[PDB]
Amino acid sequence: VAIRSEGVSETQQNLEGVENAMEDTADSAGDSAAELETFSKRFKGAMG
Amino acid sequence: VAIRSEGVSETQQNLEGVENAMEDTADSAGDSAAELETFSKRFKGAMG
C-alpha cells in the first residue's frame, strides 16, 4: 500500500519547479542587461 | 484493480524531480546569452 506517498512526494518536486522557474525568470530578465553596457561603451563612436 | 496498484507511482514522483533537475540547467543555459553579449562588450567598445 502506498496511497499517501504517491500524492505528497510529487509536491516536493513542484516546490523545486517553482524555484527553478523563478531562477529562469531571473536569468532571462538578465537578457535585458546582456547588450546594455555593450551598446553604451560603443556609443562614444557616435559622438566621435 | 487494487493489487500492487500504487507501487509503480513513485517512478512518476521521482521523474518529475529530473525535470526540475533540468530547469536548473535551462535557467543557466539561458544566462549564456549574457556571457556572449558581455564578451562582445570588449570588441564593440574597442570599435568605440
Coordinates of N, CA, C and O in Angstrom, one line a residue:
Chain A
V1 N 0.9 -1.2 0.0 CA 0.0 0.0 0.0 C 0.9 1.2 0.0 O 1.8 1.3 0.8
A2 N 0.6 2.2 -0.9 CA 1.4 3.4 -1.0 C 0.5 4.6 -1.3 O 0.9 5.6 -2.0
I3 N -0.7 4.6 -0.8 CA -1.8 5.6 -1.1 C -1.5 7.0 -0.7 O -1.8 7.9 -1.4
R4 N -0.7 7.2 0.4 CA -0.3 8.5 0.8 C 1.0 9.0 0.0 O 1.0 10.2 -0.4
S5 N 2.0 8.2 -0.1 CA 3.3 8.6 -0.5 C 3.3 9.2 -2.0 O 4.1 10.1 -2.3
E6 N 2.4 8.6 -2.8 CA 2.3 9.0 -4.2 C 1.8 10.4 -4.4 O 2.3 11.1 -5.3
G7 N 0.9 10.9 -3.5 CA 0.3 12.2 -3.6 C 1.2 13.3 -3.1 O 1.1 14.4 -3.6
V8 N 2.0 13.0 -2.1 CA 2.8 14.1 -1.4 C 4.1 14.2 -2.1 O 4.6 15.3 -2.3
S9 N 4.8 13.1 -2.5 CA 6.2 13.1 -3.0 C 6.3 13.9 -4.3 O 7.5 14.2 -4.7
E10 N 5.2 14.1 -5.1 CA 5.3 14.9 -6.3 C 5.4 16.4 -5.9 O 6.1 17.2 -6.6
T11 N 4.8 16.9 -4.8 CA 4.8 18.3 -4.4 C 6.2 18.8 -4.0 O 6.5 20.0 -4.3
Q12 N 7.0 17.9 -3.5 CA 8.4 18.2 -3.2 C 9.2 18.6 -4.4 O 10.1 19.4 -4.4
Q13 N 8.8 18.0 -5.6 CA 9.3 18.3 -6.9 C 8.7 19.6 -7.4 O 9.5 20.5 -7.8
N14 N 7.4 19.8 -7.3 CA 6.7 21.0 -7.7 C 7.3 22.3 -7.0 O 7.3 23.3 -7.6
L15 N 7.7 22.1 -5.7 CA 8.4 23.2 -5.0 C 9.7 23.6 -5.7 O 9.9 24.8 -5.9
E16 N 10.6 22.6 -6.1 CA 11.8 22.9 -6.8 C 11.5 23.5 -8.2 O 12.3 24.3 -8.7
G17 N 10.4 23.1 -8.8 CA 9.9 23.6 -10.0 C 9.6 25.1 -10.0 O 10.0 25.8 -10.9
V18 N 8.9 25.5 -8.9 CA 8.6 26.9 -8.6 C 9.9 27.7 -8.5 O 10.1 28.8 -9.2
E19 N 10.9 27.2 -7.8 CA 12.2 27.9 -7.5 C 13.0 28.0 -8.8 O 13.6 29.0 -9.0
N20 N 13.0 26.9 -9.6 CA 13.8 26.8 -10.8 C 13.2 27.6 -11.9 O 13.9 28.2 -12.7
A21 N 11.9 27.7 -11.9 CA 11.2 28.7 -12.8 C 11.4 30.1 -12.4 O 11.6 31.0 -13.3
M22 N 11.6 30.4 -11.1 CA 11.9 31.7 -10.6 C 13.4 32.1 -11.0 O 13.6 33.2 -11.5
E23 N 14.3 31.1 -10.9 CA 15.7 31.3 -11.4 C 15.7 31.6 -12.9 O 16.5 32.4 -13.3
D24 N 14.9 30.9 -13.6 CA 14.7 31.1 -15.1 C 14.2 32.5 -15.3 O 14.8 33.1 -16.2
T25 N 13.2 33.0 -14.6 CA 12.7 34.3 -14.8 C 13.8 35.4 -14.5 O 13.9 36.4 -15.1
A26 N 14.7 35.1 -13.5 CA 15.8 36.0 -13.1 C 16.9 36.0 -14.2 O 17.4 37.0 -14.5
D27 N 17.3 34.8 -14.7 CA 18.3 34.6 -15.7 C 17.9 35.2 -17.0 O 18.7 35.8 -17.7
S28 N 16.6 35.0 -17.4 CA 16.0 35.5 -18.6 C 15.9 37.0 -18.5 O 16.1 37.7 -19.5
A29 N 15.5 37.6 -17.3 CA 15.4 39.0 -17.1 C 16.8 39.6 -17.2 O 16.9 40.8 -17.6
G30 N 17.9 38.8 -16.9 CA 19.3 39.2 -17.2 C 19.6 39.5 -18.7 O 20.6 40.2 -18.9
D31 N 18.8 39.0 -19.6 CA 18.9 39.3 -21.0 C 18.7 40.8 -21.3 O 19.3 41.3 -22.2
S32 N 18.0 41.5 -20.4 CA 17.7 42.9 -20.5 C 19.0 43.7 -20.1 O 19.0 44.9 -20.3
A33 N 20.0 43.0 -19.6 CA 21.3 43.6 -19.3 C 22.4 43.2 -20.3 O 23.4 43.8 -20.3
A34 N 22.2 42.2 -21.1 CA 23.2 41.4 -21.9 C 24.0 42.3 -22.8 O 25.2 42.3 -22.7
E35 N 23.3 43.1 -23.6 CA 24.0 44.1 -24.6 C 23.9 45.5 -24.1 O 24.1 46.4 -24.9
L36 N 23.6 45.8 -22.8 CA 23.3 47.1 -22.3 C 24.6 48.0 -22.3 O 24.6 49.0 -23.0
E37 N 25.6 47.6 -21.5 CA 26.9 48.2 -21.4 C 27.6 48.1 -22.8 O 28.3 49.0 -23.2
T38 N 27.3 47.0 -23.5 CA 27.8 46.6 -24.8 C 27.4 47.7 -25.9 O 28.2 47.9 -26.8
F39 N 26.2 48.3 -25.8 CA 25.9 49.4 -26.6 C 26.5 50.7 -26.1 O 27.0 51.5 -26.9
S40 N 26.4 51.0 -24.8 CA 26.7 52.3 -24.3 C 28.2 52.6 -24.4 O 28.6 53.7 -24.6
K41 N 29.1 51.6 -24.2 CA 30.5 51.7 -24.2 C 31.0 51.8 -25.7 O 32.1 52.4 -25.9
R42 N 30.2 51.4 -26.7 CA 30.5 51.6 -28.1 C 30.1 53.0 -28.5 O 30.8 53.6 -29.3
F43 N 29.0 53.5 -27.9 CA 28.3 54.7 -28.4 C 29.1 56.0 -28.5 O 28.6 56.9 -29.2
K44 N 30.2 56.1 -27.8 CA 31.1 57.3 -28.0 C 31.7 57.3 -29.4 O 32.3 58.4 -29.7
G45 N 31.6 56.2 -30.1 CA 31.8 56.2 -31.5 C 30.9 57.1 -32.3 O 31.3 57.7 -33.3
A46 N 29.6 57.2 -31.9 CA 28.7 58.2 -32.4 C 29.2 59.6 -32.2 O 29.2 60.4 -33.2
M47 N 29.6 59.9 -31.0 CA 30.0 61.3 -30.6 C 31.3 61.7 -31.3 O 31.4 62.8 -31.8
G48 N 32.2 60.7 -31.4 CA 33.4 60.9 -32.2 C 33.1 61.1 -33.7 O 33.7 62.0 -34.3
Chain B
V1 N -7.8 -4.9 -10.3 CA -8.0 -3.4 -9.9 C -7.0 -3.1 -8.8 O -5.9 -2.7 -9.1
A2 N -7.3 -3.4 -7.5 CA -6.4 -3.0 -6.4 C -5.5 -4.1 -5.9 O -5.7 -4.7 -4.9
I3 N -4.4 -4.3 -6.7 CA -3.3 -5.2 -6.3 C -2.0 -4.6 -6.8 O -1.9 -4.3 -8.0
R4 N -0.9 -4.4 -6.0 CA 0.3 -3.8 -6.2 C 0.2 -2.4 -6.9 O 1.1 -2.0 -7.6
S5 N -0.9 -1.7 -6.6 CA -1.5 -0.7 -7.5 C -0.9 0.7 -7.4 O -1.1 1.5 -8.2
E6 N -0.1 0.9 -6.3 CA 0.4 2.2 -6.0 C 2.0 2.2 -6.1 O 2.6 3.2 -6.0
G7 N 2.6 1.0 -6.2 CA 4.0 0.8 -6.2 C 4.8 1.4 -7.3 O 5.9 1.9 -7.2
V8 N 4.2 1.4 -8.5 CA 4.8 2.0 -9.7 C 4.7 3.5 -9.7 O 5.6 4.1 -10.3
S9 N 3.8 4.1 -8.9 CA 3.5 5.5 -8.9 C 4.8 6.3 -8.7 O 5.0 7.4 -9.3
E10 N 5.6 5.9 -7.7 CA 6.7 6.7 -7.2 C 7.8 6.9 -8.3 O 8.6 7.8 -8.2
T11 N 7.7 6.1 -9.4 CA 8.6 6.4 -10.6 C 8.3 7.7 -11.2 O 9.1 8.4 -11.7
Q12 N 7.0 8.1 -11.2 CA 6.5 9.4 -11.7 C 6.9 10.5 -10.8 O 7.5 11.5 -11.2
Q13 N 6.8 10.3 -9.4 CA 7.2 11.3 -8.4 C 8.7 11.5 -8.4 O 9.1 12.6 -8.2
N14 N 9.5 10.5 -8.8 CA 10.9 10.6 -9.0 C 11.3 11.4 -10.3 O 12.1 12.2 -10.2
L15 N 10.6 11.0 -11.4 CA 10.9 11.5 -12.7 C 10.6 13.0 -12.9 O 11.2 13.7 -13.7
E16 N 9.5 13.5 -12.1 CA 9.2 14.9 -12.0 C 10.4 15.6 -11.6 O 10.7 16.7 -12.1
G17 N 11.1 15.1 -10.6 CA 12.3 15.7 -10.0 C 13.5 15.9 -11.0 O 14.2 16.8 -10.9
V18 N 13.5 15.0 -12.0 CA 14.5 15.0 -13.0 C 14.3 16.2 -14.0 O 15.3 16.8 -14.5
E19 N 13.0 16.5 -14.2 CA 12.7 17.7 -15.0 C 13.1 19.0 -14.2 O 13.7 19.9 -14.9
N20 N 12.9 19.0 -12.9 CA 13.3 20.2 -12.1 C 14.9 20.3 -12.1 O 15.4 21.4 -12.2
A21 N 15.5 19.1 -12.1 CA 17.0 19.0 -12.2 C 17.4 19.2 -13.7 O 18.6 18.9 -14.0
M22 N 16.5 19.7 -14.5 CA 16.9 20.2 -15.9 C 16.5 21.7 -16.0 O 17.1 22.4 -16.8
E23 N 15.5 22.1 -15.2 CA 15.1 23.5 -15.2 C 16.2 24.3 -14.6 O 16.5 25.4 -15.1
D24 N 17.0 23.8 -13.6 CA 18.2 24.4 -13.0 C 19.4 24.3 -14.0 O 20.5 24.6 -13.5
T25 N 19.2 23.8 -15.2 CA 20.1 23.9 -16.3 C 19.6 24.8 -17.4 O 20.4 25.5 -18.1
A26 N 18.3 24.8 -17.6 CA 17.6 25.7 -18.6 C 17.7 27.2 -18.3 O 18.0 27.9 -19.2
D27 N 17.6 27.5 -17.0 CA 17.8 28.9 -16.5 C 19.2 29.4 -16.9 O 19.3 30.5 -17.4
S28 N 20.2 28.6 -16.7 CA 21.6 28.9 -16.7 C 22.2 28.7 -18.1 O 23.2 29.4 -18.5
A29 N 21.6 27.8 -18.9 CA 21.8 27.8 -20.4 C 21.2 29.1 -21.0 O 21.8 29.6 -22.0
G30 N 20.2 29.7 -20.4 CA 19.7 31.0 -20.8 C 20.7 32.1 -20.5 O 20.9 33.0 -21.3
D31 N 21.3 32.1 -19.3 CA 22.3 33.1 -18.8 C 23.5 33.2 -19.8 O 24.1 34.2 -19.8
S32 N 23.7 32.1 -20.6 CA 24.8 32.1 -21.6 C 24.6 33.2 -22.6 O 25.6 33.6 -23.3
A33 N 23.4 33.8 -22.8 CA 23.2 34.9 -23.6 C 23.9 36.2 -23.1 O 24.4 37.0 -23.9
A34 N 23.9 36.3 -21.8 CA 24.6 37.4 -21.1 C 26.1 37.2 -21.2 O 26.9 38.2 -21.2
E35 N 26.6 36.0 -21.2 CA 28.0 35.7 -21.4 C 28.5 36.3 -22.7 O 29.4 37.1 -22.7
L36 N 27.8 35.9 -23.8 CA 28.3 36.2 -25.2 C 28.1 37.7 -25.4 O 29.0 38.3 -26.0
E37 N 27.1 38.4 -25.0 CA 26.9 39.8 -25.2 C 27.8 40.6 -24.3 O 28.0 41.8 -24.5
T38 N 28.4 40.0 -23.2 CA 29.4 40.7 -22.4 C 30.8 40.4 -23.0 O 31.7 41.3 -22.9
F39 N 31.0 39.3 -23.6 CA 32.2 39.0 -24.4 C 32.3 40.1 -25.6 O 33.4 40.6 -25.8
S40 N 31.2 40.4 -26.2 CA 31.1 41.3 -27.3 C 31.3 42.8 -26.8 O 31.7 43.6 -27.6
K41 N 31.1 43.0 -25.5 CA 31.2 44.4 -24.9 C 32.6 45.0 -25.1 O 32.8 46.2 -25.3
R42 N 33.6 44.1 -25.0 CA 35.0 44.5 -25.2 C 35.3 44.9 -26.7 O 35.8 46.0 -26.9
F43 N 34.9 44.1 -27.6 CA 35.1 44.3 -29.0 C 34.3 45.4 -29.6 O 34.8 46.2 -30.5
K44 N 33.0 45.5 -29.2 CA 32.1 46.6 -29.6 C 32.6 47.9 -29.0 O 32.7 48.9 -29.7
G45 N 33.0 47.9 -27.7 CA 33.7 49.1 -27.1 C 35.0 49.5 -27.7 O 35.3 50.7 -27.7
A46 N 35.8 48.5 -28.2 CA 37.0 48.7 -28.9 C 36.8 49.4 -30.3 O 37.7 50.1 -30.7
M47 N 35.7 49.1 -30.9 CA 35.3 49.9 -32.1 C 35.0 51.3 -31.7 O 35.4 52.2 -32.4
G48 N 34.3 51.5 -30.6 CA 34.0 52.8 -30.0 C 35.3 53.6 -29.8 O 35.4 54.8 -30.2

